[PDB]
């Protein structure tokens, strides 16, 4: 068999954006196996060893003015630059969620399921309403699921004691639509 | 927030290298190191942007060289195998005979080497399957996705079969209607 030991090395340049390209932070990090050793935080301005393993690198990299100058300006020439290039098809990408309501194959009380799938971006807000009023207790979510294909999904149940005539509404607010999406369950 | 990540890695002694761009956790693209060209996660991206693939090849070379130096100065401290958390789900609420897709989530593992196989009633499936490359995680472990387009039925029973050095034995995640 293959029992040879493995040795991994990762380099990551993270561009963090808040309020568009208003504030931008660049975090350059090195990881040996599972241990981050060195990093360049644009908020810091220079490399910093994260563990003793990285000390040599931080010291050597910080001794290169040209490296530091280019690195310091990367928040503009790299981050803000790439944001401007891909913004149109990433930050603005939008796919409306497919919403459907049905009772769970679980069950006295009746467990309702609000299936919200195939949407992008991931930020979405789903709430349950009984007769037009928010439901706090009894709600249980599966959590936001990222499908790895630029799509997300989630299921949000609502345990209930159904009374003929009641109207349980599942409400979904998402960037893809101006007005919320509603799907009712008629008791 | 909003995060764009340029992630790369190199693994010895498998000599596996990867170079990809990430946006809020979703892959924008990665570079095919053999064909030396850019492969966009979604076809459409390649029409709205471009990228110099050769440049990833320059970085990868540096990455390896760096790996060799680090390996040596850590006294050949090997990576600890961390087994994957495997989950199987469908892309949307399943309905009999209504085309759907099986997603196999292989998450929180390292090193970035894995053998994934789909099974339909104990037999391996090939047609229509697709998979992603290794995706980065804040904890520096990896995630990965395998897909299997399928036609729901009551008889069929599927398994996402995953092998990883972290696993003493093949892990089979079951999924049926």
């Amino acid at each position: 068999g293959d029992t040879r030991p493995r040795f991994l090395w990762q380099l990551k340049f993270e561009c963090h954006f808040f309020n568009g390209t208003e504030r931008v932070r660049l975090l350059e990090r090195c990881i040996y196996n599972q241990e981050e050793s060195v990093r360049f935080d644009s908020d810091v301005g220079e490399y910093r060893a994260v563990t003793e393993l990285g000390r040599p690198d931080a010291e050597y990299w910080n001794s290169q003015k040209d490296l530091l100058e280019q690195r310091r300006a990367a928040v503009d020439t790299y981050c803000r630059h790439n944001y401007g290039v891909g913004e149109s098809f990433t930050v603005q990408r939008r796919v409306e969620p497919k919403v459907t309501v049905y009772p769970s194959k679980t069950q006295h009380h009746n467990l309702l399921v609000c299936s919200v799938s195939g949407f992008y971006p991931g930020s979405i807000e789903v709430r349950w309403f009984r007769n037009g009023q928010e439901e706090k207790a009894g709600v249980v979510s599966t959590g936001l699921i990222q499908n790895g294909d630029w799509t997300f999904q989630t299921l949000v149940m609502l345990e209930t004691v159904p009374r003929s005539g009641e109207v349980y509404t599942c409400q979904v607010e998402h960037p893809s639509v101006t007005s919320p999406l509603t799907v009712e369950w008629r008791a | 927030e909003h995060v764009i990540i340029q992630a790369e890695f190199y693994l010895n002694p498998d000599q596996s290298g990867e170079f990809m761009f990430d946006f809020d956790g979703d892959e924008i693209f990665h570079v095919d190191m053999a064909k030396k060209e850019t492969v966009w996660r979604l076809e459409e991206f390649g029409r709205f942007a471009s990228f110099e693939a050769q440049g990833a090849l320059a970085n990868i070379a540096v990455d390896k060289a760096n790996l060799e130096i680090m390996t040596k100065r850590s006294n050949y401290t090997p990576i600890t195998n961390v087994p994957p958390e495997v989950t199987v789900l469908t892309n949307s609420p399943v309905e009999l005979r209504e085309p759907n897709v099986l997603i196999c989530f292989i998450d929180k593992f390292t090193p970035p080497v894995v053998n994934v196989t789909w099974l339909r009633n104990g037999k391996p499936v090939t047609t229509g399957v697709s998979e992603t490359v290794f995706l980065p995680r804040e904890d520096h472990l990896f995630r990965k996705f395998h897909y299997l387009p399928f036609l729901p039925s009551t008889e069929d029973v599927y398994d996402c079969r995953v092998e990883h050095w972290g696993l003493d034995e093949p892990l089979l995640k079951h999924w049926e209607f």
């Binding site: 690198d57 630059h81 290039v85 | 942007a49 990228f51 110099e52």
Partner: peptide, 15 residues
């Protein structure tokens, strides 16, 4: 389309 810029990997100090 528009070009996505790369950041060059930094060589660590030699042995």
């Amino acid at each position: 389309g528009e070009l996505i810029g790369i950041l060059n990997a930094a060589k660590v100090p030699a042995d």
